[PDB]
Design a binder for this molecule. Structure first.
Ligand SMILES: NC(=O)C1=CN([C@@H]2O[C@H](COP(=O)(O)OP(=O)(O)OC[C@H]3O[C@@H](n4cnc5c(N)ncnc54)[C@H](O)[C@@H]3O)[C@@H](O)[C@H]2O)C=CC1
Ligand SMILES: NC(=O)C1=CN([C@@H]2O[C@H](COP(=O)(O)OP(=O)(O)OC[C@H]3O[C@@H](n4cnc5c(N)ncnc54)[C@H](O)[C@@H]3O)[C@@H](O)[C@H]2O)C=CC1
Ligand SMILES: NC(=O)C1=CN([C@@H]2O[C@H](COP(=O)(O)OP(=O)(O)OC[C@H]3O[C@@H](n4cnc5c(N)ncnc54)[C@H](O)[C@@H]3O)[C@@H](O)[C@H]2O)C=CC1
Ligand SMILES: NC(=O)C1=CN([C@@H]2O[C@H](COP(=O)(O)OP(=O)(O)OC[C@H]3O[C@@H](n4cnc5c(N)ncnc54)[C@H](O)[C@@H]3O)[C@@H](O)[C@H]2O)C=CC1
Ligand SMILES: O=C1C[C@@H](c2c(Cl)cccc2Cl)CC(O)=C1Sc1ccccc1Cl
Ligand SMILES: O=C1C[C@@H](c2c(Cl)cccc2Cl)CC(O)=C1Sc1ccccc1Cl
Ligand SMILES: O=C1C[C@@H](c2c(Cl)cccc2Cl)CC(O)=C1Sc1ccccc1Cl
Lengths: 331, 331, 331, 331
């Protein structure tokens, strides 16, 4: 006899399991930018947020819920407990430890391993069949860590890797050429961040190879200094941090694009971090970015890119370094 | 010649004005949430940001630019100087000071007036024919201030007003009824914030009046205490602030919804703040929220909601209160 | 090795059961309009088309496939055999025979029943747990027929019903009032087509009831003859047929809106046809339109609209006529 | 006081012009496929339709209007008279005879040139600053014709050209490689018709050149016979026409893709019909497809593709064929 009862007749109460649920672990600037971008792209019928800071977590959940009128994602939930993440198709990890001043790489990585040791088994408990997308840095090593802890098959553990680096590269390329980034093609591969590799041979507009038109492209004898574009990719990341104190929007949008391919089974190709053992004379269990076909099974295939000697040596050097760190990790 | 000349043959030099340009003034959490939501809804062909904090502004601009690959807004600019905002169709003001410890309400209002005294003339100078959308608080007073300083006609000066209040109300309504907020209709009008008025007579699902079904709706004798739903709207605002320190996602989404109606000339009805002199016995130059028709020329029409005597007296009290503050203001 | 094997390294060979699949049965003007609208709203990860005309079916499939670059639906299939429809979440039936000159109600219906006797069991064989959305006319009877043949529970059998009727009504309302139809609320219920019932008490803008401002609303003595709006809804149908020979675009869009609620579990309220036995003194198994909550389990709840005495009698008269035809159908 | 006056208080009247008006000439299968695709991409604030068949025209207009609740384009108009098209930003021409089974698009010249002689002056009369987008066949020849008749600068006269052939090519490529067409890059240039040219040398995935991996690619000695893919592109329209009588959906999507770049000033690269005088030693005023940068001024730049000697020969042969036809036209 309540108002709801007067107004609404119920036919059935049954089931109700999310069909396209996504979880974001960690609700810092990066996690929440991933969340808003995913929400505005209608990728999920349920979004779950997890963090260890409970106040912050509740506030972010409520803020998103309050915009429900303007969205098409009918259920947004959160909690410190992983039961809220049950039955996720895709779980995106942005949680981790921030590197201290003077702190060694091994030490920082070890701190994040200890964090993943709590996070990953809980994610797996509640969504045994999800794809894991790792955003946390250092992304290539932490993708390895998530893979190691989860026990997932290689296809279901994806690192955001060089996706953002490549998007920045295409923005800068577009600016130089006066063309939309969508029509400017180019690939930054290997280790995410400072050591990434710009594959000059693949840079093209409408299938016209820039390297072929301009053989000095990428080299030190290039009067147009196209090498500076890749340098600006690296520099701009530290610049944004210096200017606003963190980065969020671009990473959020790039993560949503990966999630789109995965959730809708598109099988588009993105530069993301995957287990690269067997390529480029790499014989250790290390993850680096190559172009990968992404769909409902995660990474079902990868593209074998022909690299120059110098490009190959750079990936190989990254692989040697990552393994040097990984082999000393305590799981 | 240059690589660019080898690759591209130019037919046309003469660039043109952006035709659907939007500016956001103030790049705090609210401003940037407005920005990301506007970008992901493809409402503008050029977006400008303005603020007085130069480093923050550049970093926000760059972060958005870096996501350009995933967007359809070909130009993002920013600057302290308002020449970057030239020819904006719509200018959204989210700039404001935060009330300090020990600071009176009147003194806070005056500080925001002093900020508008600098912002408004600059906006008007570069976009004399734009629509102004005021979000800064107290929004009803600052919308009056923008109107007064700009010398714009009332149709082109629009306050966010009770747009967010109403969205929260409908989210809460939807939760109670188990229906999507899009299908739960209800209007919160009058003075934005603590003094807003839930118009019980208009609350409905499928044109079925909740108040006709449940006569006690919105009263103290309401067995179900639906009054609490409005109370929760106001409570939730302070709770989000207590939990995450500010609010962003919901207001940003709601502002973008307004921007969509205006930019696309939709003539949808939204609860926004408008000059209401001559209504409900109000005879002063004050702005309050009623349902307004939004389109290309801003507020072309407003819906005259039938209000109960009690409801009318509340708006009247708000009007008296607002005018009493405005008459003491120093322009 | 093949060029493919040289380019791409495979991690694993698929292949999941369809996750978000929609089938459209009948690729006439209505079926294809549904298909293009569903494709452009990104509602499905797989679309299947079925018809009995094999060249037409294949050509339509190919035409859509050729636009794959512009879409986000990676798999489009078709066939006379229902094996192509397997594991559909939602199956939309637009198949029917066009009514002949000088053919009774009972005989046109019987022709479509004979069609359904073949279609329905095939659909059920390959997607035993799908939701069925019936569009074929007369839609209220054929929804009952699909319900009886399929053996599905009532929540999983939905008729488009008065969805299109209400969309036309709101377009006409918006034209009169100079407001977007999204903001012009009004419900046409009961039997689809000639005998539908415009519910005057629910017609409102911003929660302001027109019936309360204008008591004569929808009566004979109404100086503004608002009854003519509903008359125009009915006349519109026949005029479009007269003018272009069939209708496609509006019905296509309205159906895709229903699919959106179902595929995305939105729980929005739509006017669709559902099993109405138990309401308004209706004691026969008939399907009439009321506002229903649509989500992942089809119709989970319906809204109990308060109807006047005359409104109720019109529904009952419809139920009687519908049952009178149904009790004579040979299954 | 009428009901509207009771319900709505007007602030100001006076009609405003649309900001983003699009006209479609011809409401045949192609015209209406363009219309629905453009409406569902929210590209226009006004859509105008023109045809010589007056009832069909009214019927198609009404059918779209009835779908308004589901669209974000507030005004749709139609008329035999070109006054309905005034102030259009973009005018799309789809009127005219279409090829029948086994008939060449080149067999349509006399018919369609005659029709253009009436259409083009009318369009230019009412929208002197519009971009013209030509779709009618044979599209390259009719783009030249529209150019000559209108007296527009060539940047503002665009033929839909090979955007669709390239889309078909990429669809077929993606099917062979198991990758989404978006990630498969390959260009088909020249005549939208039998003499189109597949640019093997530019085909790639993730910047990896398929020709470098597979030197025989596209030649007669290709063990995988990739030339058959281009052959399928050439035969595409014929097959679809033989099956369903005409093509519509793919071209509708292609046209909307072009219209999006134009209306939103994206500066994306598309192969469209334009004047290629000055490229590849061509001295004639011939129109055919090469990659162009598309934006608010139409075609602002051409991308200069480096063709192999064999590719260049085929393109010049295409140009020879088309110019032989164009040059005989009398105005
Ligand atoms: N792969 C890429 O291209 C990029 C990666 N990143 C990385 O993304 C990560 C996050 O970025 P920010 O949001 O700025 O950092 P943040 O520190 O502001 O946010 C991290 C959140 O994770 C939470 N967290 C910590 N331990 C947790 C646990 N055991 N369980 C659940 N949550 C926990 C924290 O409470 C915090 O809220 C960083 O590692 C950053 O370096 C950032 C930009 C680009
Ligand atoms: N109408 C509504 O429903 C809501 C309104 N608000 C209001 O939005 C306003 C801002 O929100 P927040 O982003 O949290 O504030 P914030 O303090 O974080 O950001 C404000 C920005 O305004 C800038 N600013 C100050 N003076 C300026 C000037 N003279 N020119 C240009 N920029 C200037 C500041 O530098 C700062 O970046 C506040 O007034 C707040 O109350 C917030 C939520 C809801
Ligand atoms: N509920 C509503 O508001 C509306 C309903 N409709 C109804 O939609 C239906 C279709 O309309 P149109 O597309 O214009 O008719 P149509 O005649 O052009 O298309 C019918 C298609 O169904 C096919 N079909 C016939 N038997 C079949 C079978 N046994 N299996 C599979 N396919 C079969 C036909 O081959 C044909 O392709 C009609 O019943 C029409 O009245 C139309 C408009 C609105
Ligand atoms: N560029 C491309 O890739 C494609 C081009 N086409 C071409 O598009 C054209 C149209 O095809 P459909 O729409 O299928 O033909 P349709 O026969 O379905 O419709 C054509 C319309 O043009 C109208 N029309 C004729 N003369 C007119 C005039 N003087 N003014 C205004 N309207 C006039 C007709 O009345 C008719 O409604 C054909 O030339 C066809 O070959 C078709 C598919 C693809
Ligand atoms: O853009 C950032 C912020 C960076 C960061 C953060 Cl979030 C916090 C403190 C310091 C840094 Cl460098 C973390 C990170 O990986 C990136 S992407 C990046 C970094 C270096 C070179 C190239 C690229 Cl594309
Ligand atoms: O939700 C917020 C944050 C609030 C705020 C801010 Cl931004 C900063 C400091 C304190 C406060 Cl309360 C400013 C504001 O107007 C709102 S909306 C609101 C506020 C009170 C009652 C009802 C509503 Cl719908
Ligand atoms: O708009 C049409 C075309 C109509 C039709 C067809 Cl598809 C073919 C031949 C004749 C007719 Cl009437 C089939 C139909 O149900 C509708 S909707 C409708 C019909 C009557 C009154 C009100 C409405 Cl909203």
């Amino acid at each position: 006899a309540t108002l709801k009862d007067q107004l609404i007749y119920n036919l059935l109460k049954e089931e109700q399991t999310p069909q396209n649920k996504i979880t974001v672990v960690g609700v810092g600037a990066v996690g929440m930018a991933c969340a808003i971008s995913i929400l505005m792209k209608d990728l999920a019928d349920e979004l779950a947020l997890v963090d260890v800071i409970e106040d912050k977590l509740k506030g972010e959940m409520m803020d998103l819920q309050h915009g429900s009128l303007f969205l098409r994602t009918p259920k947004i939930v959160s909690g410190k407990d992983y039961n809220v993440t049950a039955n996720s198709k895709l779980v995106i990890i942005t949680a981790g430890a921030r590197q201290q001043e003077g702190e060694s790489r091994l030490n920082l990585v070890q701190r994040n391993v200890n964090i993943f040791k709590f996070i990953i088994p809980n994610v797996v408990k509640y969504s045994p069949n999800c794809k894991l997308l790792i955003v946390s840095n250092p992304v290539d090593i932490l993708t390895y860590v998530a893979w190691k802890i989860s026990g997932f098959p290689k296809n279901r553990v994806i690192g955001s890797g060089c996706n953002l680096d490549s998007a920045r590269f295409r923005y800068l390329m577009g600016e130089r050429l006066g063309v939309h980034p969508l029509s400017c093609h180019g690939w930054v591969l290997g280790e995410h961040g400072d050591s990434s590799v710009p594959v000059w041979s693949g840079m093209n507009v409408a299938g016209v190879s820039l390297k072929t038109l301009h053989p000095d492209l990428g080299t030190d004898k290039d009067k147009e200094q196209w090498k500076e574009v890749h340098k600006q990719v690296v520099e701009s990341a530290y610049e944004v941090i210096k200017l606003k104190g963190y980065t969020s929007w671009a990473i959020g949008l790039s993560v949503a694009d990966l999630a789109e391919s995965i959730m809708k089974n598109l099988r588009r190709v993105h530069p993301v971090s995957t287990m690269i053992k067997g390529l480029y004379g790499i014989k250790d269990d290390v993850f680096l970015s190559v172009p990968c076909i992404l769909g409902q099974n995660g990474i079902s295939d990868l593209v074998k890119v022909t690299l120059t000697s110098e490009e190959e040596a750079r990936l190989k050097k990254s692989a040697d370094t990552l393994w040097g760190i990984q082999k000393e990790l305590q799981f």
